[PDB]
Design a binder for this molecule. Structure first.
Ligand SMILES: Nc1ncnc2c1ncn2[C@@H]1O[C@H](COP(=O)(O)OP(=O)(O)NP(=O)(O)O)[C@@H](O)[C@H]1O
Ligand SMILES: Nc1ncnc2c1ncn2[C@@H]1O[C@H](COP(=O)(O)OP(=O)(O)NP(=O)(O)O)[C@@H](O)[C@H]1O
Ligand SMILES: [Mg+2]
Ligand SMILES: [Mg+2]
Ligand SMILES: [Mg+2]
Ligand SMILES: [Mg+2]
Ligand SMILES: [Mg+2]
Ligand SMILES: [Mg+2]
Ligand SMILES: [Mg+2]
Ligand SMILES: [Mg+2]
Ligand SMILES: [Mg+2]
Ligand SMILES: [Mg+2]
Ligand SMILES: [Mg+2]
Ligand SMILES: [Mg+2]
Ligand SMILES: [Mg+2]
Ligand SMILES: [Zn+2]
Lengths: 49, 230, 547
RNA sequence: GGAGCUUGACUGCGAGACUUACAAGUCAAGCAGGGACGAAAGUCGGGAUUAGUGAUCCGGCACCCCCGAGUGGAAGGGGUG
RNA sequence: UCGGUACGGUUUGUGUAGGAUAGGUGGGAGACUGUGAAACCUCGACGCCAGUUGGGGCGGAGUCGUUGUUGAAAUACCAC
C-alpha cells in the first residue's frame, strides 16, 4: 500500500532518490524537482517502471 | 505449354549443377530462332529485405553489351541538350517534356538530367515513380556530366534491384552472341553483386541461382564458382 | 518460424491484485488469438505491456527485431484536425514527412548547392519504391471507402460514437504492424462494420490479439483462445463455446476442493482448542500445520457478486412521451423526417440503426438538450427522466470513484429514500478500498458500471440507456437484463448487440431508410425476433482497403 | 483553524556534545554547491516531541570505468546508490 | 502407417474504373498448332456468381497477345 519507489532524472536517467508514495492516492508517477549531483542543478525527477 | 517444344526441356538435367560456361551452351540450344531470345539470370540471395540495410541495389557495366535498342530521354537545356543529341540520344527533351510524359507517353528506358532540371521532373515523377523510369543520382543519371551517361546506356548499364521476396533479375545479352561472350558479361555481374553485399547478411549469400531464356526452362548453375568464368 | 513477441517469467501485480505470475508464451506470425476473461482479470494491462507503454515488475517481456506494434486502446484517442488528417498520423505517419521533404527539395535544391542535396533527394527516393508512396493520395481514398468513413473536411468533435471508432480503425489498419493489439474493436460499431472486420482479420499477415466479450466476433476471427484467471494464463484452442465449459469446470473442482479443505480445518481447530492433558505435550508440528492451513484458507475468498438493482421511481401515468411529426437536422442532411410515435408504459423500447443515423440525437430531443426543427415532443406531468450524456460532463479523471457518484457527501437521495453513498457504490461492485480508484485507472467494465451509478441515482421512472451492453462480461450482462425486466417503468435502449435486443425488448424503433428518403423510421409493436420476420414482408464484395 | 506559491521528504561535509560493556541510538551551530518561500531579516538536511522495526554473510539491480591471471577484449570481482 | 526437413510437379489470389477473378519482380513480340483452334454435351475439383480440364466433333482453321481502352500496375508466354 506504501511501496518504495525510486526517482530518476529526466535528462541523464540516474536514480538519485528513493521514497514512498501511496498507491491508491497517487496511481500515476511522481514528478518532483530534486537536485541531481551528476547535472549539478535541480531538475525534474520522475518514477521508474 | 506441354507441347512439342518440350524436347528442348529434355536436355537440361534438373539435378546437374552446371558451370557458367555450360550455361551459355544450354541457353542457345533451348531457345528457338524465331524470336532472338534474351538470356536471363535469376539469383535468389540470402538477404532479408525487411531490414533496410540489407537492400542490394546497384548497377553494372557490361563489357560486351547486351543487344538492346536503349531508348534514352534526356532532361537538359543549352549545350547539355545539344551534347546528348550529339551523343546518340534520339529523344532529348526539355522543360516541355513535362507536358509530353503525363499525356500518356513514356517511350523511353532511362532518364538523364542535370540537378537543375530535376526541380521540375520530380513533380511529374508521380507516374515515373513505380515504373523505374525515375532519375536516380547514384547510377550517374543526376549529375553535371550528362554526356558519358548516354554512351553507358548504349554501353550496357543494367539496373538490378532485389525484389520484396529476395530475388535478383538480370539480363546478360542476346542469344545471337557466343558462348564465351555470355559468360564474360555473367562474371562481370557476380563480381558486382559481391561488392554490394550487405555487411549484416546472415548465412550463405548466393543460395540458389539459375539461367534461362525468354521461353526455355531453368538451368541450374554452381554458386561456388566466383573466379573462373573464363 | 521466427516469432514476433515472447514473454519470459513475467510477473505484473498491482499490490494484492496480481495480473501475471510467472507466465511464458510466444506469439508467432499467422496467429489469430482471442483473449478472454472477466472484468478485473487484467486483459487491457497485458496489451499495454505488449505495446511498450507499460513495463512489467520483473521478468523480460520483449519484442522481436523489427516487428513494429500498433495498439487500439479501449478508449482510442484522436487529434483535433480533419478526418483526412486523422488517418495520416498512423499508417502514413513517418512516410508523409519523407513526402513532405521530397517536395521541399524539389525547389530548395534548385536555388542551392547541388552536391550534398543530391543524395538527400536520393535516399528519400530509395524510400519511395519499396514502400510505394508515389500514389499516397489514393491509398487514403481507398482506406476511407472500406470502413465507410465520414467525409474528409469535417472536424472530429461532432462525430458519432461509432464514427470515432471507424476513424481509429483506419489508423492501425494502414500501418499493417506485425502485432495487432485490438482492445474491444467491435464497440460502438453496427452489424455492417463488424462483418467487415471479420473478413479483414481473416486474411491478415501477422499476429492478432483481440480482447472481446461477445461470442460471435471471436468465433470468426480467432482460432486460439487465451484466458486470464487470477494471475494465470491458460492457452488452448476452441471456439468460446468450450471456453465457458472449461471456465465453469475449474470452479467446479475448486469448489469441492476448498470445501474438503474446510472440513479438515474444523477437525483440526477442535484439536488445537482441546487442551493439553497430563504430562504428554501437544505437538508443535501439528500447531504449525494448522497455522499454515488457516493461511491457505484465506487466499481463496473469491465470491463477491452483487446484482444490479435499479431503483423504482414514482407511479407513471398514461402519457410517457408523445412525438408528433418530428424533424431534426444539423445541415441540409436530414436525420428524422415525419416521425410520430408514443412511448408505452412498462415496456422496453429498442432503437435500431447503423452508424451516424441519429439514435443519440433522438434522445437529446426527448431530454430537451436539443430542439425540434418542426413538430413537438410532449412529456407528461408524471414522467421523471434519467439520462446522462457521454460527452457533456461524463466523469472527471482525478476525482475518486466515490466522489463521482457522491459529491463528497455521506448519504444520498436515490429518489425519496435515504441510502448511504458507500452502501450505494458497493451495491455496484466497487467494494473495499477500490472506492478510492480515480476515474483514469478504472477499466472499461467499471466505467460502464460507474456510468450506470450516475444515471440511476436520479430515481426516474423513464430511464434512457445509450449502449449499456458495452464492456460488460456475460455474468453482469445477464444481471443487467434481469433488472430491466423487473422494472415497472419504461426503458429505452439503444444498442447494436443483436442478441441483447432479441432477449429483453417489447417495442422496436428502427431506421428503414433507402435511397429516395434516407431519413424515415418505423415503430413496431413487438419484440426484435418478430421485427425481423415483419421486415422481409414489407422490405456483398469485401472492400479491400489495400493493394 | 485558513489561504497563496512550492519540493530542503536535498548533494558534498560537519567543530562539539548526550547516551553507552561492545555493537549501536540521538542532537548539532556553521561552511560550499544548487534551489523553495519572503520586500527584507532570514527559515527549510520531512512531520509539536519521543514508537512504526532487523546486525553480518550471501545474492539482485542501476551507475562509476577502478583491477582485467601471456598482450588486446570479455567473464568474474570492486566502488557509490 | 502418421509427423518433420530437403528437392520437385500441378494449383491458389475478385474494389473503385477497365471485354474481367490483374499475387510480386524481371524478360518479352510472338506463344501454340500428333487433337479441347471451333463445339456442344456430360461428369470430378474451388467458390465472391466462374476458373479450374479426365474428352466424346477428333489431325484443320484460328484461339490468345503485340494496337486501342481503363487504371497504382497490364493482359500471350516463360523464368525465379
Ligand atoms: N452537433 C452536431 N453538429 C453536426 N452534426 C452532428 C452533430 N452531432 C451529431 N452530428 C451528426 O449526426 C449524425 C448522427 O449523430 P448521432 O446521433 O450521434 O449518431 P449515432 O446514433 O450516435 N451513431 P452511433 O451511436 O455510433 O451508432 C452523424 O452524421 C453525426 O456526425
Ligand atoms: N495504475 C493502476 N493502479 C492501480 N490499480 C490499477 C491500475 N491500473 C489498473 N488497475 C486495476 O487493475 C485492473 C486491471 O484492468 P484490466 O482488467 O486490465 O481492464 P480490463 O480487463 O480490460 N476490464 P474489461 O475491458 O472490462 O475486461 C483495473 O480494473 C483496476 O482495478
Ligand atoms: Mg492527491
Ligand atoms: Mg479493456
Ligand atoms: Mg451514439
Ligand atoms: Mg525520505
Ligand atoms: Mg562528527
Ligand atoms: Mg546557499
Ligand atoms: Mg525572490
Ligand atoms: Mg541547518
Ligand atoms: Mg508523531
Ligand atoms: Mg553465518
Ligand atoms: Mg587478459
Ligand atoms: Mg562488468
Ligand atoms: Mg560519498
Ligand atoms: Zn540528472
Amino acid at each position: 500500500v506504501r511501496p518504495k519507489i525510486t526517482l530518476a532524472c529526466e535528462v541523464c536517467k540516474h536514480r538519485n532518490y528513493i521514497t514512498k508514495k501511496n498507491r491508491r492516492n497517487d496511481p500515476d508517477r511522481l514528478e518532483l524537482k530534486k537536485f541531481c549531483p551528476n547535472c549539478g542543478k535541480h531538475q525534474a525527477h520522475r518514477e521508474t517502471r | 505449354t506441354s507441347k512439342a517444344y518440350r524436347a528442348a526441356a529434355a536436355k537440361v538435367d534438373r539435378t546437374n549443377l552446371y558451370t557458367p560456361l555450360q550455361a551459355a551452351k544450354l541457353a542457345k540450344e533451348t531457345s528457338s530462332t524465331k524470336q532472338d531470345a534474351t538470356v536471363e539470370v535469376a539469383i535468389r540471395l540470402g538477404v532479408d529485405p525487411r531490414k533496410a540495410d540489407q537492400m542490394v541495389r546497384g548497377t553494372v557495366n557490361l563489357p560486351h553489351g547486351t543487344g538492346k535498342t536503349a531508348r534514352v530521354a534526356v532532361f537538359a537545356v543549352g549545350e547539355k541538350a545539344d551534347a546528348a543529341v550529339a551523343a546518340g540520344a534520339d529523344v532529348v527533351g526539355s522543360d516541355d517534356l513535362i507536358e509530353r510524359i503525363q499525356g500518356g507517353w513514356l517511350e523511353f528506358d532511362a532518364a538523364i538530367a542535370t540537378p537543375d532540371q530535376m526541380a521540375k521532373v520530380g513533380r511529374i515523377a508521380r507516374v515515373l515513380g513505380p515504373r523505374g523510369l525515375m532519375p536516380n543520382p547514384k547510377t550517374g543519371t543526376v549529375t553535371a556530366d550528362v554526356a558519358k551517361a548516354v554512351a553507358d546506356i548504349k554501353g550496357g548499364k543494367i539496373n538490378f534491384r532485389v525484389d520484396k521476396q529476395a530475388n535478383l533479375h538480370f539480363v546478360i545479352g542476346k542469344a545471337s552472341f557466343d558462348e564465351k561472350l555470355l559468360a564474360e558479361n555473367y562474371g562481370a555481374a557476380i563480381d558486382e553483386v559481391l561488392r554490394l553485399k550487405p555487411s549484416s547478411s546472415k548465412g550463405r549469400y548466393l543460395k540458389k541461382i539459375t539461367v534461362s531464356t525468354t521461353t526455355g526452362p531453368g538451368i541450374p548453375v554452381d554458386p561456388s564458382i566466383t573466379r573462373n568464368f573464363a | 518460424a521466427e516469432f514476433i513477441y515472447t514473454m519470459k517469467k513475467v510477473r505484473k501485480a498491482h499490490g494484492d491484485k496480481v495480473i501475471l505470475d510467472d507466465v511464458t508464451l510466444s506469439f508467432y506470425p499467422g496467429a489469430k488469438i482471442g483473449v478472454v476473461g472477466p472484468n478485473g482479470a487484467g486483459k487491457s494491462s497485458v496489451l499495454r505491456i505488449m505495446a511498450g507503454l507499460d513495463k512489467p515488475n520483473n521478468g523480460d517481456a520483449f519484442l522481436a527485431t523489427g516487428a513494429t506494434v500498433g495498439i487500439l486502446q479501449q478508449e482510442p484517442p484522436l487529434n483535433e484536425d480533419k478526418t483526412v488528417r486523422g488517418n495520416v498520423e498512423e499508417g502514413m505517419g513517418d512516410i508523409k514527412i519523407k513526402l513532405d521533404r521530397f517536395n521541399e527539395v524539389a525547389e530548395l535544391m534548385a536555388t542551392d548547392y547541388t552536391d550534398e542535396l543530391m543524395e538527400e533527394m536520393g535516399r528519400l527516393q530509395e524510400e519511395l519504391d519499396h514502400a510505394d508512396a508515389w500514389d499516397l493520395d489514393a491509398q487514403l481514398e481507398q482506406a476511407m471507402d472500406a470502413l465507410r468513413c465520414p467525409p474528409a473536411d469535417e472536424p472530429v468533435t461532432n462525430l458519432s460514437g461509432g464514427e470515432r471508432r471507424r476513424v481509429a480503425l483506419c489508423k492501425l489498419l494502414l500501418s499493417k504492424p506485425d502485432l495487432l493489439l485490438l482492445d474491444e474493436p467491435t464497440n460502438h460499431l453496427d452489424a455492417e462494420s463488424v462483418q467487415w472486420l471479420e473478413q479483414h482479420l481473416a486474411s491478415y499477415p501477422g499476429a492478432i490479439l483481440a480482447v472481446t466479450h461477445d461470442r460471435y466476433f471471436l468465433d470468426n476471427v480467432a482460432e486460439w483462445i487465451l484466458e486470464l484467471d487470477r494471475g494465470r494464463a491458460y492457452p488452448y484452442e476452441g471456439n468460446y463455446s468450450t471456453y465457458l465449459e472449461k471456465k465453469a469446470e475449474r470452479l467446479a473442482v475448486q469448489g469441492r476442493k476448498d470445501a474438503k479443505l474446510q472440513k479438515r480445518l474444523t477437525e483440526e481447530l477442535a484439536w488445537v482448542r482441546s487442551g493439553a492433558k497430563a504430562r504428554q505435550a501437544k505437538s508443535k508440528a501439528r500447531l504449525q500445520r494448522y497455522e499454515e492451513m488457516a493461511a491457505e484458507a484465506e487466499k481463496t475468498r473469491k465470491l463477491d457478486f452483487e446484482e444490479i438493482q435499479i431503483p423504482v421511481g414514482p407511479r407513471l401515468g398514461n402519457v410517457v412521451v408523445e412525438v408528433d411529426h418530428l424533424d431534426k437536422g444539423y445541415d441540409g442532411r436530414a436525420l428524422i423526417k415525419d416521425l410520430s410515435f408514443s412511448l408505452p408504459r412498462n415496456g422496453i423500447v429498442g432503437v435500431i440503426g447503423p452508424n451516424g443515423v441519429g439514435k443519440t440525437t433522438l434522445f437529446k430531443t426527448i431530454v430537451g438538450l436539443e430542439t425540434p426543427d418542426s413538430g413537438s415532443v410532449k412529456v407528461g406531468e408524471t414522467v421523471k427522466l434519467s439520462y446522462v450524456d457521454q460527452a457533456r460532463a461524463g466523469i472527471d479523471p482525478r476525482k475518486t470513484v466515490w466522489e463521482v457518484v457522491s459529491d463528497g457527501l455521506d448519504y444520498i437521495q436515490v429518489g425519496q429514500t435515504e441510502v448511504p453513498s458507500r452502501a450505494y457504490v458497493s451495491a455496484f461492485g466497487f467494494k473495499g478500498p477500490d472506492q478510492q480508484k480515480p476515474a483514469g485507472v478504472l477499466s472499461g467494465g467499471e466505467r460502464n458500471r460507474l456510468n450506470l451509478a450516475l444515471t440511476l441515482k436520479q430515481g426516474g421512472n423513464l430511464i434512457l440507456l445509450d449502449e449499456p451492453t458495452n464492456d460488460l462480461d456475460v455474468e453482469t450482462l445477464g444481471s443487467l437484463e434481469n433488472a430491466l425486466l423487473n422494472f415497472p417503468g419504461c426503458a429505452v435502449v439503444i444498442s447494436h448487440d443483436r442478441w441483447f435486443l432479441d432477449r429483453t425488448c417489447t417495442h422496436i424503433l428502427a431506421w428503414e431508410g433507402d435511397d429516395d428518403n434516407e431519413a424515415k423510421w418505423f415503430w413496431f409493436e413487438g419484440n426484435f425476433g418478430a421485427y425481423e420476420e415483419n421486415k422481409v414482408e414489407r422490405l456483398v464484395t469485401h472492400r479491400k482497403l489495400t493493394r
